[PDB]
Amino acid sequence: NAQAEEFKKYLETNGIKPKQFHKKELIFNQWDPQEYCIFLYDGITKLTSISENGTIMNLQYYKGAFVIMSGFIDTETSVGYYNLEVISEQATAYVIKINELKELLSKNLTHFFYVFQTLQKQVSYSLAKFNDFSINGKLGSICGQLLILTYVYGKETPDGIKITLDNLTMQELGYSSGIAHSSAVSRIISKLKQEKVIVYKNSCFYVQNLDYLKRYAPKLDEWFYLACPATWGKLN
Amino acid sequence: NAQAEEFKKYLETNGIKPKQFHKKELIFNQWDPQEYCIFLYDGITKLTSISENGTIMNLQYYKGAFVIMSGFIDTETSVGYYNLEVISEQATAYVIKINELKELLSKNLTHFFYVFQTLQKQVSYSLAKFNDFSINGKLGSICGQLLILTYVYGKETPDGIKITLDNLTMQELGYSSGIAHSSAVSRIISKLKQEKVIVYKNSCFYVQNLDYLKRYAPKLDEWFYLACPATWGKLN
Ligand SMILES: N[C@@H](CCC(=O)N[C@@H](CS)C(=O)NCC(=O)O)C(=O)O
Ligand SMILES: N[C@@H](CCC(=O)N[C@@H](CS)C(=O)NCC(=O)O)C(=O)O
Ligand SMILES: O=P([O-])([O-])O
């Protein structure tokens, strides 16, 4: 990622130091009024929200390089209360106060357009996700989430496309899919297993019929093709 | 409003002319190869996706002023294929070819930050919406959609918060909530009318218990209070 590499140097030139975060640590949390611009440079995270009754929702994962905003650039107020939890072992994040972002970007438009590009990908990612997760009930939600996971963390193997995430549980899939009961997730995953769309080996999920997932997640496959052509081409 | 007015003036100074659209017309469509930046100045539109079999997904509405992107600024590639359909009797929009937007924003940081702000509001809207529409099943989806419509198009009256849309139908709510058949939508709407949450009179829906909707759409309620406080204050 060339544009992300130059944006890293620029932040170090301007005195923003890398911060090391560890698995299960929260880079920010929904119970703290802190507005940031997190340039996640390396590692994997998940954006989560917890209800007043304990319902956990995984809004999405982020895999560096990428930008996550918790406050508005103009009003410096909160965009909404979320937690950014690290799920990889180590994560390298450049934490920026929202009150100093406007000046950092105005100075250098190349960097400003990089952050803007990142936000455009975020906008269209969420739209595609909303479409695919809505039109085919919970089957499409699971297939949509599996397709995302296959593209962003998958690697080709003879057993299929291995989703390389440590402890991807039925529970997590449920939190990413709006399914609170792990057993309800299993009922869908089990059906996908009998049709041999996926197999569970080596504590990992192997996707064996990608075309099946595409059929129940068409706008997400379209989005990866248009927005992440290199990610899409690795598995096609 | 103010920032949008200045952006409108700026657009006309650079030769971008306003264009009138009438109900049902598509400002852009999902088979067009050309991509745009649409500055919706006035009117109401919906962003849709039509599947091969003619199934319709309503991704959301847009009420001017706002910015809708169909292509990436940095690559001039499509972000995903959607239709932008006018649902007000008339809409006024400035149609900016995507390959001209980079220069327009480079030349004026005030407007660059305005467009950036609108994309941030899009991001936070979609995340909140995704949280509420996923958690409480179909009821949460309808209540969340109704809450959105209450805040954006609602008018206080002695009979309740009048959703001021011409012909809000049961199918339209289904398209917007991701629900297959009008059957389940009628089943939910019936129960909500029974519980005094809403009523249908004068060919419009009136919300009589806003707190019931807040209960099933807390993240969207949070988002209107944080990102559209004036809009939120209208009803609280
Ligand atoms: N660094 C990669 C990935 C950035 C990223 O995390 N993108 C989000 C979409 S806005 C994503 O792919 N999320 C995958 C998930 O939800 O697991 C890139 O720039 O393409
Ligand atoms: N022009 C108003 C409204 C802009 C707008 O349409 N925002 C979207 C969210 S990105 C919305 O409220 N949609 C309501 C809906 O989906 O009905 C503003 O700038 O606050
Ligand atoms: O729609 P569903 O299949 O019931 O999820």
Ligand SMILES: O=P([O-])([O-])O
């Ligand atoms: O998740 P669960 O409920 O335990 O199944």
Ligand SMILES: O=P([O-])([O-])O
């Ligand atoms: O929607 P429906 O199928 O007619 O019920």
Ligand code: NA
């Ligand atoms: Na277009």
